């Protein structure tokens, strides 16, 4: 099927600063959504039913000023990493359904030969394979440099599975998760500004595990909002429950599509 050429946003961790982080993420965000569907002020991503494969994935090229470079394929419908190309090689997480496995075929069509992992890129799997939870894995510019190098040397043979999986958790959190939430983006910019290496707080973990849940809650909400509180965490492990959309508007940047508007028009 596919001709065209997917879109490419590149970032470099080399002389990384809070502005080039910030402009990397607006450029990712502006490449995931088409502007058509905003609901209670947040953008909604495309529906994977109605989508041509040429509109399906965007490409992120990351590099080091310390040599290497890798390209991650983001899926436009959930902003999440499906795989990557390193050198002459292309590696993909194991598609969990028949529609997706056909799609992934169109990603890095020039490569010598594509390899499909036995595991998925859902954190559950990746963190078991790293032997370490997201709370023990640090985030910051210096973690992503390392991760680009680990990703790059799995093609050659440094390889080592725990470390690959730990590099995947760092990339997905500093690109996909930061695109989805202006809270996690700013969290990553606090680390770059002060040269911190820091494991993410309980706040960050809960938002990430609630992305699909907040997208449903906001989309089937009423006006005002919602049929059930979504419970969330503070930076310190605490409390609160959310019953409405207004607190969520400066904190979710993108939502996955759950249901169409009441006709093509609303919010």
């Amino acid at each position: 099927i596919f001709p065209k050429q997917y879109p490419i946003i590149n970032f470099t961790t080399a002389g990384a600063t809070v502005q080039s982080y910030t402009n990397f993420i607006r450029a990712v965000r502006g490449r995931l959504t088409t502007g058509a569907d905003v609901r209670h002020e947040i953008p909604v991503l495309p529906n994977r039913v109605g989508l041509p494969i040429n509109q399906r994935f965007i490409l992120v090229e990351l590099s080091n000023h310390a040599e290497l470079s890798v390209t991650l394929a983001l899926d436009v419908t959930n902003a999440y990493v499906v795989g990557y190309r390193a050198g002459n090689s292309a590696y993909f997480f194991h598609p969990d359904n028949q529609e997706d496995a056909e799609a992934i075929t169109h990603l890095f069509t020039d490569v010598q030969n594509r390899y499909t992992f036995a595991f998925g890129g859902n954190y559950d799997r990746l963190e078991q394979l790293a032997g370490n939870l997201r709370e023990n894995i640090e985030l910051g510019n210096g973690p992503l440099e390392e991760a680009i190098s680990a990703l790059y040397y799995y093609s050659t043979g440094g390889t080592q599975l725990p470390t690959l999986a730990r590099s995947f958790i760092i990339c997905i959190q500093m690109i996909s998760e930061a695109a989805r939430f202006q809270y996690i983006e700013g969290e990553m910019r606090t680390r770059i500004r002060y040269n911190r290496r820091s494991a993410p707080d309980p706040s960050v973990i809960t938002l990430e595990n609630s992305w699909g849940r907040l997208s449903t809650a906001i989309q089937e909400s009423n006006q005002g909002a919602f049929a059930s509180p979504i419970q969330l965490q503070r930076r310190n492990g605490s409390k609160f429950s959310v019953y409405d959309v207004s607190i969520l508007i400066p904190i979710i940047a993108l939502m996955v599509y759950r249901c169409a508007p009441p006709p093509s028009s609303q919010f």
Binding site: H40, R235, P250, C259
Partner: protein, 262 residues
């Protein structure tokens, strides 16, 4: 999957100074006054409201109804059948307004005194006209981080941006259901600008007038908007040391981008 199946949640409606929308003395007789009252812990029907698919708000079988379509009339409870169909009708907006679509006469509270009867008034986007459907009766206490990673800080009558000493003369804020941003240690004090035009006069002045200018929205694009004037919170010159947060139109630069860090 499907067109979005929307619901009908049983929620409290919280509004000026933190008080919940209430059916007076717990009685449902046609004509009884809806009023502002301290929020209750328990399940008394007179403070819980069902947002129905047909756009009526219902405490215990009866609808919140406006007396008439004029600035000044009170809001009362009324059996939905007997009551004039589009006077039982209300829309709840993302920016905290419950309107009755017959001009923009808005649910309002004109005193924030316990027991005040609710009236409908013309829409000037004021604190006495911001409402939140929520069963969460306490405001959200956050730190607001803005230009160069600096925190918003109030020290008695002024507010400016300074660095986040995560314990300091405070810089933790309570964000109320009426749309006000209040300095957490003095909670009957409000982030206030005598807006309409501009400049620093984003002071900390009592919440009591409940003005437009004391009402603020945190938008998706990171700005803190004054709903009324249409201008956003702006650090003068992008210069933290001038110690002034003015009000200015949206250009989109970092000195107008803020974040709620909880």
């Amino acid at each position: 999957a499907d067109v979005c199946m929307d619901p009908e949640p049983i929620v409290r409606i919280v509004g000026r100074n933190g008080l919940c929308v209430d059916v007076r003395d717990g009685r449902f007789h046609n004509g009884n006054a809806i009023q502002l009252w301290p929020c209750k812990s328990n399940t008394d029907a007179n403070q819980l409201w069902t947002l129905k698919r047909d756009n009526t708000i219902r405490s215990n079988g009866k609808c919140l109804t406006t007396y008439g379509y004029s600035p000044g009339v009170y809001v009362m409870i009324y059996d939905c059948n007997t009551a004039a169909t589009d006077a039982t009708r209300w829309q709840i907006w993302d920016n905290g307004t419950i309107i009755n679509p017959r001009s923009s006469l808005v649910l309002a509270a004109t005193s924030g005194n316990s027991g005040t009867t609710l009236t409908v008034q013309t829409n000037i986007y004021a604190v006495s006209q911001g409402w939140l459907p929520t069963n969460n009766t306490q405001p959200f206490v956050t730190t607001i981080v803005g230009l160069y990673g600096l925190c918003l800080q109030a020290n008695s009558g002024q507010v400016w941006i300074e660095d986040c000493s995560s314990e300091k003369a405070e810089q933790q804020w309570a964000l109320y259901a009426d749309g006000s941003i209040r300095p957490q240690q003095n909670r009957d004090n409000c982030l206030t600008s005598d807006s309409n035009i501009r400049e620093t006069v984003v002071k900390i002045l009592s919440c009591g007038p409940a003005s437009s200018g004391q009402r603020w929205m945190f938008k998706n694009d990171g700005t803190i908007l004054n709903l009324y004037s249409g201008l956003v919170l702006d650090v003068r010159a992008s210069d933290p040391s001038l110690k002034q947060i003015i009000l200015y139109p949206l250009h989109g630069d970092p000195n107008q981008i803020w974040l709620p860090l909880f």
